[PDB]
Every structure is written in C-alpha cells, then in structure tokens.
Design a protein around this motif. Sequence first.
Motif, mmCIF file in Angstrom:
data_model
loop_
_atom_site.group_PDB
_atom_site.id
_atom_site.type_symbol
_atom_site.label_atom_id
_atom_site.label_comp_id
_atom_site.label_asym_id
_atom_site.label_seq_id
_atom_site.Cartn_x
_atom_site.Cartn_y
_atom_site.Cartn_z
ATOM 1 N N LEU A 211 13.091 -4.681 -0.055
ATOM 2 C CA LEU A 211 12.052 -5.679 0.107
ATOM 3 C C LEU A 211 11.361 -5.555 1.487
ATOM 4 O O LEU A 211 10.133 -5.756 1.612
ATOM 5 C CB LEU A 211 12.613 -7.101 -0.091
ATOM 6 N N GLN B 207 -3.511 -6.375 -6.538
ATOM 7 C CA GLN B 207 -3.028 -6.745 -5.238
ATOM 8 C C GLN B 207 -2.353 -8.096 -5.416
ATOM 9 O O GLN B 207 -3.026 -9.108 -5.360
ATOM 10 C CB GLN B 207 -4.259 -6.845 -4.332
ATOM 11 N N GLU C 115 5.823 -17.996 3.427
ATOM 12 C CA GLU C 115 5.645 -17.169 2.280
ATOM 13 C C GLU C 115 6.973 -16.745 1.687
ATOM 14 O O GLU C 115 7.011 -16.324 0.522
ATOM 15 C CB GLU C 115 4.780 -15.959 2.623
ATOM 16 N N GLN D 202 4.356 -3.615 4.337
ATOM 17 C CA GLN D 202 3.062 -3.267 3.753
ATOM 18 C C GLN D 202 2.060 -4.409 3.857
ATOM 19 O O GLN D 202 0.924 -4.239 4.288
ATOM 20 C CB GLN D 202 3.215 -2.848 2.289
ATOM 21 N N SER E 199 -1.341 -17.748 -0.477
ATOM 22 C CA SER E 199 -0.634 -16.683 -1.192
ATOM 23 C C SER E 199 -1.341 -15.330 -1.136
ATOM 24 O O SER E 199 -0.718 -14.344 -1.462
ATOM 25 C CB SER E 199 -0.352 -17.056 -2.648
ATOM 26 N N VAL F 77 -3.081 -14.045 1.736
ATOM 27 C CA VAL F 77 -3.149 -13.494 3.062
ATOM 28 C C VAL F 77 -2.264 -12.252 3.205
ATOM 29 O O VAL F 77 -2.647 -11.289 3.852
ATOM 30 C CB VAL F 77 -2.782 -14.533 4.119
ATOM 31 N N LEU F 78 -1.088 -12.279 2.594
ATOM 32 C CA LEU F 78 -0.138 -11.137 2.621
ATOM 33 C C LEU F 78 0.085 -10.597 1.191
ATOM 34 O O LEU F 78 0.641 -11.287 0.338
ATOM 35 C CB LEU F 78 1.207 -11.562 3.239
ATOM 36 N N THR F 79 -0.353 -9.385 0.916
ATOM 37 C CA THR F 79 -0.236 -8.911 -0.434
ATOM 38 C C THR F 79 0.245 -7.468 -0.520
ATOM 39 O O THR F 79 0.311 -6.778 0.457
ATOM 40 C CB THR F 79 -1.561 -9.019 -1.113
ATOM 41 N N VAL F 80 0.575 -7.034 -1.718
ATOM 42 C CA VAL F 80 1.147 -5.737 -1.951
ATOM 43 C C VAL F 80 0.394 -5.034 -3.126
ATOM 44 O O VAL F 80 -0.004 -5.663 -4.082
ATOM 45 C CB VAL F 80 2.639 -5.939 -2.286
ATOM 46 N N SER F 81 0.184 -3.741 -3.075
ATOM 47 C CA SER F 81 -0.385 -3.100 -4.227
ATOM 48 C C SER F 81 0.578 -3.135 -5.401
ATOM 49 O O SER F 81 1.726 -2.757 -5.281
ATOM 50 C CB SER F 81 -0.682 -1.657 -3.906
ATOM 51 N N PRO G 145 9.527 -18.972 -2.441
ATOM 52 C CA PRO G 145 10.153 -18.330 -3.597
ATOM 53 C C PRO G 145 11.681 -18.334 -3.530
ATOM 54 O O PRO G 145 12.346 -18.305 -4.576
ATOM 55 C CB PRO G 145 9.611 -16.893 -3.555
ATOM 56 N N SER H 167 6.931 -10.521 -4.517
ATOM 57 C CA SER H 167 7.938 -9.526 -4.138
ATOM 58 C C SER H 167 9.266 -10.207 -3.839
ATOM 59 O O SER H 167 10.330 -9.802 -4.297
ATOM 60 C CB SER H 167 7.497 -8.767 -2.890
ATOM 61 N N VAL H 168 9.209 -11.253 -3.042
ATOM 62 C CA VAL H 168 10.405 -12.004 -2.784
ATOM 63 C C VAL H 168 10.952 -12.512 -4.114
ATOM 64 O O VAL H 168 12.119 -12.397 -4.355
ATOM 65 C CB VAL H 168 10.169 -13.138 -1.789
ATOM 66 N N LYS H 169 10.122 -13.035 -4.992
ATOM 67 C CA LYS H 169 10.646 -13.527 -6.273
ATOM 68 C C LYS H 169 11.434 -12.470 -7.041
ATOM 69 O O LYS H 169 12.545 -12.731 -7.503
ATOM 70 C CB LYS H 169 9.533 -14.045 -7.176
ATOM 71 N N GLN H 170 10.835 -11.287 -7.174
ATOM 72 C CA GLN H 170 11.432 -10.168 -7.914
ATOM 73 C C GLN H 170 12.760 -9.771 -7.293
ATOM 74 O O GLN H 170 13.737 -9.557 -7.992
ATOM 75 C CB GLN H 170 10.476 -8.966 -7.924
ATOM 76 N N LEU I 142 2.758 -11.486 -1.563
ATOM 77 C CA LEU I 142 4.077 -11.164 -1.104
ATOM 78 C C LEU I 142 5.102 -12.106 -1.677
ATOM 79 O O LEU I 142 6.211 -11.678 -1.888
ATOM 80 C CB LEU I 142 4.164 -11.204 0.424
ATOM 81 N N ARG I 143 4.778 -13.375 -1.880
ATOM 82 C CA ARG I 143 5.727 -14.305 -2.535
ATOM 83 C C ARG I 143 6.381 -13.673 -3.756
ATOM 84 O O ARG I 143 7.596 -13.818 -3.972
ATOM 85 C CB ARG I 143 5.029 -15.543 -3.080
#
Lengths: 98, 91
Positions: free
Chosen positions: B20, A24, B50, B26, A8, A10-14, B54, A30-33, A27-28
């Motif tokens: 998204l 940070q 990934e 990003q 979870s 490896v790929l992240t967002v600020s 979700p 972001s998809v959830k939101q 990315l999971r």
Amino acid sequence: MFEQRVNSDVLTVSTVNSQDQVTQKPLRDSVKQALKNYFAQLNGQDVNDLYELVLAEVEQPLLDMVMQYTRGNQTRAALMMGINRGTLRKKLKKYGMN
Amino acid sequence: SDVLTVSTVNSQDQVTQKPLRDSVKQALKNYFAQLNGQDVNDLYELVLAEVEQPLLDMVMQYTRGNQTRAALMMGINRGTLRKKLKKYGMN
DNA sequence: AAATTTGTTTCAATTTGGAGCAAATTT
DNA sequence: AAATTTGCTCCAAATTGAAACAAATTT
C-alpha cells in the motif's frame, strides 16, 4: 469558474477499468482494498496493532516524499505537513530516515 | 512479508500484489506535480483524513458495529475511537 | 556577512489512556 | 437473567506544541 474537486480526489491512483481504460480512483479506495485483503487473509488470527500497522504504512512514504520535496529541509517539511518541527524529527527517527 | 497490499494488473492481464505504501507514494507524487509551487499547508491532516476514514469504516464493518472490539483490534483506547468516529461523523 | 536551519532544551497545551459506573443492549 | 457494550465521567500518562538560542549550514 473552477470545477469542484472533492477531498477524495486530491490524492488519487491510476486504476484500470473493465475496458482497458486508465481512470483515477481515490487513495481512500486503496486503503479500503488493503484492509479487505488483510481481513480475508487474516482468517481467525487475533489482531491488536491495526492502527499503528496502518499509520506506519502511510507515514513512511509521506515523510519520504515531503523530504524529497523540501530537498532535506526539515523546517519546511514540518511546516507543510502542519506538524511541529519536533514531531517530524521524531517520526523521521522512528523510520530511520536521516 | 507485507501484510497490507493492493492488487495491480499489468499489460499481460497478470494480477499482482503491491505494498500500500507504493500507492501512497504515487498519490503524493501526483499531488505535488499538479501543485505548481502553490504552498501546501496541512498535508499531514490531509492524508490522515484520507486513511482513518476507510480504516474506521472497515473495522466497524468487521467488528459488526461493536466499538469495544474495534478499539481493541486497532489498539487504541475505546474513548479515542468514539472521538474519531465523531470527527468524521461516522456515529 | 547574513539569513536560515539544526539540534538541543524546558514548559505549557492538547490528546490519549485507563478505570469506574448506571443504563442500555445483546446473548 | 447474565454478560457485554455503551455513553458517560474524572484523572494521569503521554504526546504535541511553541519558543528560545547557540552552532552549524546555506544563501
């Protein structure tokens, strides 16, 4: 040693937390939101194409990015995504990326 | 016009949607930065993993565990859905 | 000049799908 | 007690792969 980096992360967002503090998140999340918000707004409508809807939202930027990295080289891009070079060529066509 | 978006906050405390796809860009920008030319090997499966989680996790929420419904919402065979749920051990 | 990548094929491997059914579960 | 969903099959449709090879391109 090396500290563990879970998949979870490896790929992240600020993100910004309740304290104006830049952290940070995965990315999971972001998809959830995205889907949470899609669902609220959906409000009664029947859906049929949710997988393709998502997958398209995600493949585009992935392909975009990997080609930038491979300076347009398709053989490496397919090689690093771990997909047949034919499939890549096909996804790119799908997304008018050429 | 964009059905799949997330919330961002700017410096003035104003909240605002963003597609998204931008987040995914990003994520990867960053992935690649940190990589110092170390070869990447299964980037597709990586990202797919990934995202499907979700996705699966939320349509099951929404369809209250009803697999048949979820499979229709997404537009994939009911068999496929089971396969995936197993893939991530969500059964 | 040599090495590599591209743009095609053709065919095999894997995955997705559609339907059918008893057994279970929800309604 | 009906209706709907589950957990199977078996097949068939489709997508993905892999491997080849001129011809275009990049080194």
